[PDB]
Amino acid sequence: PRICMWKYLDIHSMHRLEKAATVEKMREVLAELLELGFPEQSLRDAIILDLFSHALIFCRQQGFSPEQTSAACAMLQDLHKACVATPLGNVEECYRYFTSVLFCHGIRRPPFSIDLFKEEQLLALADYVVNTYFRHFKLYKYVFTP
Amino acid sequence: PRICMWKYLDIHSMHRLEKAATVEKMREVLAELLELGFPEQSLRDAIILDLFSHALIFCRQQGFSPEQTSAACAMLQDLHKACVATPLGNVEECYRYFTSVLFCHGIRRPPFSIDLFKEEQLLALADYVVNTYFRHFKLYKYVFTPQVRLDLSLTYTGLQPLTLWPEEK
Amino acid sequence: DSVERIVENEKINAEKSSKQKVDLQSLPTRAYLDQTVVPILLQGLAVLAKERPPNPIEFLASYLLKNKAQFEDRN
Amino acid sequence: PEVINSELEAMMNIPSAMPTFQNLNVSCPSGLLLTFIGQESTPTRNLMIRQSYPQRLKHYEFYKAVMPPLEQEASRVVTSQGTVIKYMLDGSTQILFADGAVSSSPDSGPVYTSHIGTWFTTTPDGRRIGTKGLEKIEDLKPYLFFQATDPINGTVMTTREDKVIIVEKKDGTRVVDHADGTRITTFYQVYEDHTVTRQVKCMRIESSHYA
Amino acid sequence: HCMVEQVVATEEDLIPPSLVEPAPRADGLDYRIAAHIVSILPSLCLSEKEKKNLREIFLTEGESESKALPKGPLLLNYHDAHAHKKYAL
Amino acid sequence: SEVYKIKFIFPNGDTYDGDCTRTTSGICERNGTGTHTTPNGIVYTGSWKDDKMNGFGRLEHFSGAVYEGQFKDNMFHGLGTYTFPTGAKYTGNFNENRVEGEGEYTDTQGLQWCGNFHFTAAPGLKLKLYM
């Protein structure tokens, strides 16, 4: 559990994503940035690109500050890697792992954390997170695990 | 597009599901009704059981009557079958099919459509299948389309040594 | 044929925003403001905040009257 | 209309020392824009009303992820005969008629070139016609339709597979509600000439977000 | 007001709010795919208690602040236009 | 090397119709474009070099197997398309009549599969979706 700000997407790549006002151009930019291949040759890269693209779309729908953008993107990538790091059912371990990771961003105590965020947005995630992916955990498990 | 009230789950099975209060025994009764094997032996049955388990646990509040319940429930099952019917991409066609059956369950016109769901409810139902089963469409496509990695064995006849020009005679 | 020509005209009108002055006098408040004064006002406010003259109203009016040609003819 | 002063223009060149119809524009605080356009018949002009949302064209992507694709309209224009010509925000064109026929075109180019425009037409009885310029698209499955008749007043229903309901009464009144919520009512209203009582065809177009 | 916020953001290099992901998670993952789900949710199979427990765990705890229906059923003054804008919004 | 167009009938029943060059010893040899036909039904039409079929050409067998691509020394080498009698086709690289490297297999139903090919094996061929 560390600070994931400007870890995978920097300010320049985020500005490129910001200039892409349309869904398709932004999907192209994300594919260029993530070093993913064409979605038509591999389904895994297509799934990852769709996930990140829609993520940016709804994050557009609400509205926040850029360091939050990079923190959320890097945390998504890290927890996806953790969920697909082992083939065994590992829902609760990733659950608690990133539960610990929150406090490294939601409460102000440096250098282990920093107060970039608000309680309402947090709880919004608790909400959306436990709503979708650990429900669809087996879907990504069947794809990204040996 | 047809009315699918009690198409798959009847009032007895749904009485059993409603009596189930917790998620775990809900999933067990589903696997009993779904005729699915144990989730530990087949990942496809595990995925289907999780889909229908999140089906039962969600709709358990704001309120669909068991009628609208089995309606939307067979909606999800039928569009699952339609989406997994071909390995080729059919996102738009399955989308239109779902919306057609949606308005069959939202509009009052017997014997082809029944006023079963409300307008807030019907817009919400439209909001359902849009909002994973056409983005997770690739996940379910990879799972339930006899795999995308098929094997092959080749047996082809090569070039036999062609008869060279006989020496001049 | 009339329907097809109307479709083509709607295509052209969606491709070309009607910037005619009488058409501007009817556009909604946000749409009327965005196409008329919003960018020049934002530039004037940015210059005012960067410079901060003791006469802010006069400076903003001067900027509007000076840079009106860069926003009235681009439309 | 001004006159350019030729002498003033002929002075500036210092030699180097080296509409028939006036359109009324109406707007709603909700963002709806209305314009009366008088099309000259190929005076007697046919009045035509254009309704559009300028903000939807500017912020296309915000509304793309908010309102359903069936309501992602940029502009709709209503004829004097009832042909509702819809412009969706993605560049396609959908056409709604008073008899239940629905026409669509994803690219929305020319129909018949004597880009190539692809057009699909669904007849009120369910038959579908699709062309791409000069070639006709085959194997187009017609939409299944059903007919129910009121046994008391004799008013005849027909709802097509695309959620297009057609209401026809015995007095000639036809009410059609398309899939997008736009209702075209082909009703009638008597007119007295100074008374003689004549047969003046009228109609009504209803839409949840349009005048 | 949004003019002024635009200038302050430009001077302070504050990236516009929208095209922005945010605040990480105490059960753990990213932002979106339940704006899919919280929109997917409402069409499923059964009774009268788990959609809002899965719309308080699955529609935000911040919006789980469901006041006792005081929003719109309320008397508004003939000259109080701001109280009307607070209900529709 | 002067090139002649001749119609030669081989003693074993083979027939050739194409370009040929006479060497310094006088032996006539298939150089250039030519068509060869065997009594068993195998017919070739393509380029020739040093009495050997080298370069681009097309081969058809009696059983219906049709190969079309590059050739070097009486043998499948380089990019080529091999059509099976059942209607399936392979498009990829060839090396000594051996199917090697990345390739493409289309089954009898028109589905196209991509992946590595190893002579007589093609494990884990990925379905190519056309959208």
Interchain CB distance below 8 Å, B168 and F53: no
CA distances from A121 to A97, A105, D166, E40 (A): 19, 12, 48, 20
Q: SS in 3 state form for F26-66?
A: CCEECCEEEEEECCCCCEEEEEEECCECCEEEEEECCCCCE
What phi, psi does D121 have (nearest 5°)?
A: -120, 125
Backbone angles phi, psi at F65, to 5 degrees: -65, 120
Distances (CA, A) of D135 to C67, D130, F121: 55, 9, 44
Quote the distance between the C-alpha of residue A4 and its chain's center: 10
What contacts E22, CB < 8 A, 6 or more positions away?
A59, A62, A64, A65, A68, A69, A71, A72, A117, A121, A125, E31
Inter-chain Cβ pairs, chain C and chain E, closer than 8 A: 14
Q: Which of residues 120-159 of B touch D (CB under 8 A)?
A: 126
CA distance B33 to B20: 13
Pairing of strands D73-78, D45-52: antiparallel
Chains interfacing with C (3 or more CB pairs < 8 Å): D, E
CB atoms within 10 A of CB D23: 12
- What DSSP state is assigned to residue F15? E
Q: Write out the H or E segment, with its range, that includes residue D146.
A: strand D145-149
Residues C10, D93: C-beta atoms closer than 8 Å: yes
Closest CA relative to residue D149, chosen from D164, D168, D127: D168
One-letter amino acid of B100: S
Q: How far, in Å, CA of D174 to CA of B72, rounded?
A: 33
The dihedral through the CA atoms of B81, B86, B91, B97 has a sign that is negative
Residue E26: which of A119, D188, D156, F89 has the closest Cα?
A119
Q: F97 burial class (0-12, 13-18, 19+ CB within 10 angstroms)?
A: middle
Q: Nearest CA of chain A to the CA of D68: how many Å?
A: 15
3-state class of D36 per DSSP? strand
Q: What region, left, alpha or beta, does residue A69 occupy, with left being phi > 0 and alpha being psi -120 to 50 degrees? A: alpha
Resolution of the experimental structure, in angstroms: 7.7
Q: Which helix (H) or strand (E) holds F94?
A: strand F89-94
Q: Smallest Cα–Cα separation from C5: which of D47, D16, F120, D111?
A: D111
Tokens of D24: 């009324």
User: Å from D162 to nearest chain B CA?
Assistant: 7
Q: Tell me the pairing of strands D128-132 and F76-83.
A: unpaired
* Angle, vertex CA E8, rays to CA E3 and CA E13, nearest 5: 125
Contacts 24+ apart (CB under 8 A), D87-96: D87/C10, D87/C11, D87/C14, D87/D52, D89/D56, D89/D57, D89/D60, D89/D63, D89/D64, D93/C7, D93/C10, D93/C11, D94/D180, D95/C3, D95/C7, D96/D178, D96/D180, D96/D182, D96/D184
| Spatial separation of the C-alpha atoms in residues F68 and F87, rounded to whole Å | 14
- Among residues D104, D83, D102, the alpha carbon closest in space to that of D94 is found at D104
Grouping H, G, I as helix, E, B as strand and the rest as coil, residue C58 is helix
Place of tokens 């109280």: E83
Interface of F with B in 13-72 (CB under 8 A): 14, 26-30, 36, 38, 42, 44, 51, 53, 59, 61, 63, 65, 71
Count the neighbouring beta carbons within 10 Å of the beta carbon of residue C22.
Answer: 11
Subunits with 3+ Cβ pairs within 8 Å of D are A, B, C
Which residues from C are below 8 Å from D77, CB to CB? 6, 10
Are the C-beta atoms of B94 and B83 separated by less than 8 Å?
yes
Choose among C23, C11, C2: nearest CA to D45.
Answer: C2
Q: Is F100 helix (H, G, I), strand (E, B) or coil?
A: strand
Among candidates A47, A136, A138 on the partner chain, residue whose Cβ is nearest the Cβ of B43: A138
Side chain identity at residue F12, one-letter code = N
Encoding tokens for residue E46? 């059964």
Contact D159, D145 (CB under 8 A): yes
Any alpha helices (H) in chain B, and if so which ranges?
Answer: 11-19, 23-34, 43-58, 66-83, 91-106, 119-130, 137-144
Neighbours of C21 (CB within 10 A): 7
d(CA A40, CA D180): 33
- Return all residues near D139 (Cβ < 8 A) that are at least 6 apart: none
In angstroms, the CA D131 to CA D111 distance is 8
Contact B76, E46 (CB under 8 A): no
Instruction: Using a CB–CB cutoff of 8 Å, tell me whether B100 touches chain A.
Output: no
Q: How many CB atoms are closer than 10 A to CB D200?
A: 11
- B87 contacts F90? CB cut-off 8 A: no
Name chain C contacts of D83, Cβ cutoff 8 Å.
Answer: 3
Structure tokens of D91?
Answer: 């560049």
End-to-end Cα spacing for chain E: 17
Within 8 A of D65 by CB-CB distance, chain A residues are 23, 57-58, 60-61
What distances in angstroms separate CA D128 from CA B101, B143, D140, D141, one per listed residue? 20, 35, 6, 7
Angle, alpha carbons D118-D123-D129 (nearest 5°): 30
Tell me phi and psi for residue B158, to 5 degrees: -85, -165
* Nearest residue in E to A99, CA atom: E26
Read off the tokens for C39: 């960018």
Question: Are F61 and F39 spatial neighbours (Cβ–Cβ below 8 Å)?
Answer: no
CB contacts of D33 in chain C (<8 Å) are 26-28
C-alpha pair distances (Å), F111 with each of A3, C66, C73, D23, F104: 47, 67, 57, 58, 11
Choosing among B93, B162, B169, which should be mutated to test the F contact, i.e. which has the most F CBs within 10 A?
A: B162
CA angle (F52, F56, F57) in 5-degree steps: 80
Whether residue F93 contacts residue F78, with contact meaning beta carbons closer than 8 Å, is answered with yes
Cα three-residue angle D199-D204-D210, rounded to 5 degrees: 160
Of C3, C11, C30, the CB nearest to D95: C3
| Whole-angstrom distance, CA of residue F2 vs CA of residue D28 | 88
- Give the Cβ contact number of residue F106 at 10 Å: 18
d(CA B64, CA E56): 18
The H-assigned helical ranges of A1-146 are 11-19, 23-33, 43-62, 66-84, 91-106, 119-132, 137-144
Q: Where do the H-state alpha helices sit in B20-65?
A: 23-34, 43-58
Which DSSP category does D210 fall into? B
Contact D77, D23 (CB under 8 A): no
Nearest CB among B157, B163, B168 relative to F12 is that of: B163
User: How big is chain A, counted in residues?
Assistant: 146
Taking residue D41's Cβ as centre, other Cβ atoms within 10 Å add up to: 8
Interface contact E7-C41, CB threshold 8 A: no
Distance from CA of C70 to the nearest CA of D (A): 21
Beta carbons within 10 angstroms of residue C6's beta carbon: 20
Structure tokens at D40: 């000259």
| Angle, vertex CA A123, rays to CA A121 and CA A129, nearest 5 | 100
- Scanning B140-159 for CB atoms below 8 A from F yields 148-159
Q: Kindly report the nearest CA distance between residue E9 and chain C, in angstroms.
A: 10
Chains A and C touch (3+ CB pairs under 8 A): no
Name residue, tokens 């690739």: B138
Q: Do the Cβ atoms of B100 and D146 come within 8 Å?
A: no
How far apart CA C38 and CA C26 sit, in angstroms, is 17
CB C26 within 8 A of CB D25: yes
**Measuring CA to CA, which residue among A93, A9, A17, A8 is closest to residue A56?**
A17
SS3 at position D130 = strand
Helices (DSSP H) in C1-75: which residue ranges?
Answer: 2-15, 21-24, 29-34, 38-51, 56-66, 69-72
Is residue D114 within 8 A of residue C4, CB to CB? The reply is no
CB C10 within 8 A of CB D85: yes
Cα B38–Cα B43–Cα B46 angle in degrees, nearest 5: 55
F41 φψ region: left (φ > 0), alpha (ψ -120 to 50), beta (else): left
CA B137/CA B87 separation, integer angstroms: 11
- Token pair recorded at residue D154: 């004799």
Contact yes or no for A21 and D61 at CB 8 A? yes
Query: Could you give the CA distance from residue F126 to residue B87 in angstroms, rounded to a whole number?
Result: 12
Of F27, F51, F65, the CB nearest to B168: F27
**Three-state secondary structure call for residue F121:** strand
Say how far residue E88 (Cα) sits from the centre of its chain: 14
CA dihedral A40, A43, A49, A53 (to 10 degrees): 90
The residues pairing with D86 across neighbouring beta strands, listed in sequence order, are: D76, D94
Q: Letter for the amino acid at A46?
A: A
Cβ atoms of A31 and E32 within 8 Å: the answer is no
Looking at residue B129, its amino acid is V
Q: CB distance B61–E54 less than 8 Å?
A: yes
From residue B1, how far is each of A126, B83, B102, D162 by CA, in Å?
Answer: 37, 15, 9, 11
Q: Alpha-carbon torsion E33, E34, E38, E44, what sign? A: positive
Closest CA to D70 of D159, D210, D182: D182
Q: Does C65 touch chain D (CB under 8 A)?
A: no
CA atoms lying within 13 Å on the CB side of residue D96: 26
Touch D-C: 3+ C-beta pairs under 8 A: yes
Q: Which residues face D40 on adjacent strands?
A: D45
Q: Which of B60, B125, B126 sits opposite E51 (nearest CB)?
A: B60
Q: Tell me which DSSP letter residue A119 carries.
A: H
Alpha-carbon gap: F31 to the closest alpha carbon of chain A (Å): 42
Q: Are D131 and D114 in contact (CB under 8 A)?
A: no
Per CB-CB distance under 8 Å, the chain C contacts of E4 are 45
Query: Distance (Å, rounded) from C-alpha F99 to C-alpha F76?
Result: 9
CB proximity F124 to A under 8 Å: no
Q: Which residue has the tokens 């669909």?
A: B64
Q: Which token pair is D111?
A: 């129909």
CB atoms within 10 A of CB B124: 20
* Spatial distance between the Cα atoms of E58 and E42, rounded to a whole number of angstroms: 11
Residue D107 CA, distance from chain mean position: 17
D179 neighbourhood in chain B, CB within 8 Å: 103
CB contact under 8 A, A135 and E37: yes
CA-to-CA distance for C48 and C56, rounded, in angstroms?
Answer: 7
Contact pairs from chain A to chain D, CB under 8 Å: 12
Q: Which of A95, A120, A119, A115 is nearest to A105 (CA)?
A: A115
Among the listed residues D199, D204, D198, D201, the one whose alpha carbon sits nearest the alpha carbon of residue D183: D204
Cis peptide before D142 (omega within 30 of 0): no
Residue D139, SS3 per DSSP: coil
Q: One-letter amino acid identity for C73?
A: D
Q: Tell me the three state secondary structure of residue A88.
A: coil
Which one-letter amino acid corresponds to residue B123?
L
Instruction: Give the Cα-Cα-Cα angle A34, A38, A39 (nearest 5 degrees).
Output: 95
Beta pairing class for D183-186 and D204-206: antiparallel
Q: Is D27 within 8 Å of C27 when comparing Cβ atoms?
A: yes
Question: What residues of chain A lie within 8 A of the CB of E9, using their CB?
Answer: none
A98 touches E28 (CB < 8 A)? yes
How many residue pairs from chains A and E have C-beta atoms closer than 8 A?
198
Q: Is the sign of the CA dihedral D63, D64, D66, D69 positive or negative?
A: positive
Q: Which residues of B touch F14 (CB under 8 A)?
A: 163
CB A107 within 8 A of CB B106: no
d(CA A113, CA C54): 43
What is the least distance, in Å, from the CA of A119 to any CA of chain E?
8
Say how far apart CA D110 and CA D120 lie, in whole Å.
13
Taking residue B100's Cβ as centre, other Cβ atoms within 10 Å add up to 15
- Residue with token string 């002055």: C21
- Helix, strand, coil distribution of chain E in percent, nearest 5: 30, 0, 70
Does the N-terminal peptide bond of residue D68 adopt cis geometry, omega within 30 degrees of 0? Answer: no
Are A125 and E57 an interchain contact pair (Cβ–Cβ within 8 Å)?
A: no
Helix (H, G, I), strand (E, B) or coil at B149: strand
CB contacts under 8 A, A 3-22 vs D, are 21-22
Q: Read out DSSP for E18-54?
A: SS------SS---SSHHHHHHHHTTS-S--SSSTTTT
